[PDB]
């Protein structure tokens, strides 16, 4: 990776038709209206910092039965927006985290009446020694995790 690792590109299916790339060097990558966010997406519906993606070192206890990747890094999508975001098929409320597998489509905002729909396609171009870039490691079937003060602190420095 020369600078880019993950590519979040607001696809045509979404009200936004732009492409943003999370530099492997920037952790965590903040997205939202405010330019402060590593990613620039301004939607009156979402907060200046609707959500941010944070990368963490993927690990596990033993390798009994299951075959892990020793100890590589994975990308976690953190949502801090009050309008709640949607990752593929999992709910993302203000204060949640989710595993990002190469080719992850995340919905920042969806309005049935307003027809306001946002969605970015995550595409890992470079693999900075990733357990498997992001194919959806077994064990945990796409489940939404919760964030702690550690996560909230990340945005505090934003």
């Amino acid at each position: 990776g020369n600078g880019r690792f993950l590519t979040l590109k607001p696809l045509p299916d979404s009200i936004i038709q732009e492409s943003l790339e999370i530099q492997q060097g920037v952790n965590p990558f903040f997205i939202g209206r405010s330019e402060d966010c590593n990613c620039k997406i301004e939607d009156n519906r979402l907060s200046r910092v609707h959500c941010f993606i944070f990368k963490k070192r993927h690990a596990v206890g033993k390798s009994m039965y299951e075959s892990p990747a020793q100890g590589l890094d994975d990308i976690w999508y953190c949502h801090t927006g009050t309008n709640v975001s949607y990752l593929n098929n999992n709910r993302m409320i203000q204060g949640t985290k989710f595993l990002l597998q190469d080719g992850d489509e995340i919905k920042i905002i969806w309005d049935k009446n307003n027809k306001f729909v946002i969605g970015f396609k995550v595409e890992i171009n470079d693999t900075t020694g990733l357990f498997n870039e992001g194919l959806g490691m077994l064990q945990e079937q796409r489940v939404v995790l919760k964030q702690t003060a550690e996560e909230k602190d990340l945005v505090k420095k934003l």
Binding site: L46, G81, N83, D111
Partner: peptide, 7 residues
Amino acid sequence: EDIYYLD
């Protein structure tokens, strides 16, 4: 300082 609710 925010009042959002997409329902």
